[PDB]
């Protein structure tokens, strides 16, 4: 039951829980006043993205062998009303995906790969998908 075998959207639900119920990661200060990406209209409601997004980011690295900040920005996109203008694609915030990577690095979920870009390290490779067992075997539903 790898990250794929678990129905991937109720993965990060529990992986967000993991890193909350650990009580360590390194939550910071641009936090309560963050846009998330110039992309968006409005600061996000669940006051706790980066436990749930570092979840995403970290599992994402599981699926993909290497990923830069430039990559993370790319992936969390959207359309962007410039208003009466047509919608276009704007990269996500770097700062936040970066500090997500650097923070995952603190727990040592991840590491900097060779040839540039972050990938996840064996230790983290665990915490990630350990709970995959726990999410499949939470219950069949």
């Amino acid at each position: 039951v790898t990250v794929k075998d678990v129905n991937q959207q109720e993965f990060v639900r529990a992986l967000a829980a993991f890193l909350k119920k650990s009580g360590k990661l390194k939550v910071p200060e641009w936090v309560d006043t963050v846009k998330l990406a110039k992309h968006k209209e409005l600061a996000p409601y669940d006051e706790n993205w980066f436990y749930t997004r570092a979840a995403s980011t970290a599992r994402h690295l599981y699926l993909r062998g290497g990923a830069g900040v430039g990559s993370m920005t790319k992936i969390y996109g959207g359309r962007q009303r410039n208003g009466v203008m047509p919608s276009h694609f704007s990269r996500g915030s770097k700062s936040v995906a970066r500090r997500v990577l650097q923070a995952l690095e603190g727990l040592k979920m991840v590491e900097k790969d060779q040839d540039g870009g972050r990938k996840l390290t064996p230790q983290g490779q665990r915490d990630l998908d350990r709970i995959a067992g726990q999410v499949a075997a939470a219950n069949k539903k």
């Binding site: 309560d32 006043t33 409005l42 600061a43």
Partner: protein, 137 residues
């Protein structure tokens, strides 16, 4: 579920109790949705509630913070008033205050015979878009 407030009056401006708390802060001139959560994030008011609830301490907690923002960690994005010019004050203007400031900077531009002022005086576009076809009222 407590219907007692039946609307509220805040900061010299009429406000609606029924509307959600983040939304309610929005109405006052000088605010907007952006800054109006951030006030309710530092203040630590639970955002899942209506402006026709809360206590007098909560609503003052809003005003103390929103009227004096920088001191409660609110950075300098969410100051609409950035390097004012009449002293290098950089704070957040609210209420009629902005209408006052607004007018004063129109007055200032006008008084210094400069273009942008003339353009308000006449009633035109300031921002050089073409008014051949739009701006018809």
């Amino acid at each position: 579920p407590e219907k007692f407030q039946h609307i509220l009056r805040v900061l010299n401006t009429n406000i609606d109790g029924r509307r959600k708390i983040a939304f309610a802060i929005t109405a006052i001139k000088g605010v907007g949705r952006r800054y109006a959560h951030v006030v309710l994030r530092k203040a630590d008011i639970d955002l899942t509630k209506r402006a026709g609830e809360l206590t007098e301490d909560e609503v003052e907690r809003v005003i103390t913070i929103m009227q004096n923002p920088r001191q409660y960690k609110i950075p300098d994005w969410f100051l609409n008033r950035q390097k004012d010019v009449k002293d290098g004050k950089y704070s957040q203007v609210l209420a009629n205050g902005l209408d006052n400031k607004l007018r004063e900077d129109l007055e200032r531009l006008k008084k210094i015979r400069a273009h942008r002022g003339l353009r308000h005086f006449w009633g035109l576009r300031v921002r050089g878009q073409h008014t051949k076809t739009t701006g018809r009222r």
